[PDB]
Amino acid sequence: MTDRYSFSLTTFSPSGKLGQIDYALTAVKQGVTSLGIKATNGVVIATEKKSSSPLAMSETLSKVSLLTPDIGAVYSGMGPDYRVLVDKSRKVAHTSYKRIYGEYPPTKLLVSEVAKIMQEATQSG
């Protein structure tokens, strides 16, 4: 065994394109629409609960997730990828910030941490 894939699976093509990132964006394009609007005294995020079956209880599937008491997230694309990113984002808000400064991270920095995780899945082996 051992993970013997220690090389990048995303690489530059002759035209300068990073294929796997482009294809990931194509998967996002197929995803259900979600949006966000900023007001003077608040922000709103919204999406459609596209239920896969009417027998499914769509309340048990949360597309909009609390990351911190003052930060929320919504997505478009692959649901399972989103779910694990929410788990990682919630944890990193504690490990790389709250356990150091005794307060929750500002929106831009939590976004930065989530972005870093997503960047690494674009270069790591």
Binding site: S62, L66, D87, R90, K91, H94, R99
Partner: protein, 226 residues
């Protein structure tokens, strides 16, 4: 330090004194010993103050992540299990002695935990240097089916016994009441029976009393434009 926990009809209450010491010297006269693990799970700590704070915040942090992961409100038995397994692993070197209390979907709970990782269950508990003074009051006045008002009274009386009789304890009584189906109410400085009397004299000096060699402005601002 004197800390107590008391079970009642529809919940649990905990209280603590507000004196922290370094040997025989009082470092802080209004210390906060009641810590929050989660909104409705609170604990009080005796022993090494940094350890009691650190172990509370670590388990509190992991409890919050667990709550988000499971989509369920945190349970006292989870806090208890995580605390004891952490403390046991460090073989008493983390000097945290805690009384853990709270309400959750399962009901109301009260536990004690010692630095080596052993835990206990009880309807009334006391910890710290004033625990024997507090337990004397608890053993004298505790009964089954206490009301909320009776439990708050008993808990604060037990802390008072520590305040007056134990040199390690003093100043004020802090209380937190956790009732089933309600928000936990933290009552900071619930009792204040140790206000210092007015001094005989004002020690405000005339201006220019102190000899000065040099004065200068300290630049706290960043490098300026232009």
């Amino acid at each position: 330090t004197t800390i107590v926990g008391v079970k009642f009809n529809n919940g649990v209450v905990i209280a603590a004194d507000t004196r922290s010491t370094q040997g025989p010297i009082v470092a802080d006269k209004n210390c906060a010993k009641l810590h929050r693990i989660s909104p409705k799970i609170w604990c009080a700590g005796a022993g090494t103050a940094a350890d009691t704070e650190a172990v509370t915040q670590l388990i509190g942090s992991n409890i919050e992540l667990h709550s988000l992961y499971t989509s369920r409100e945190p349970r006292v038995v989870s806090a208890l299990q995580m605390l004891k397994q952490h403390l046991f692993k460090y073989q008493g070197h983390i000097g945290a002695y805690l009384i853990v209390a709270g309400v959750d979907p399962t009901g109301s709970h009260l536990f004690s935990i010692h630095a080596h990782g052993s835990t206990d269950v009880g309807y009334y508990l006391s910890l710290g240097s004033g625990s024997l003074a507090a337990m004397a009051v608890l053993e004298s006045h505790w009964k089954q089916d206490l009301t909320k008002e009776e439990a708050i009274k008993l808990a604060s009386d037990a802390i008072q016994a520590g305040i007056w009789n134990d040199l390690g304890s003093g100043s004020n009584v802090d209380v937190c009441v956790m009732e089933i189906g309600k928000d936990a109410e933290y009552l900071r400085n619930y009792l204040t029976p140790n206000v210092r009397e007015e001094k005989q004299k004002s020690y405000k000096f005339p201006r220019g009393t102190t000899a000065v060699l040099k004065e200068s402005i300290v630049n706290i601002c960043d490098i300026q434009e232009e």
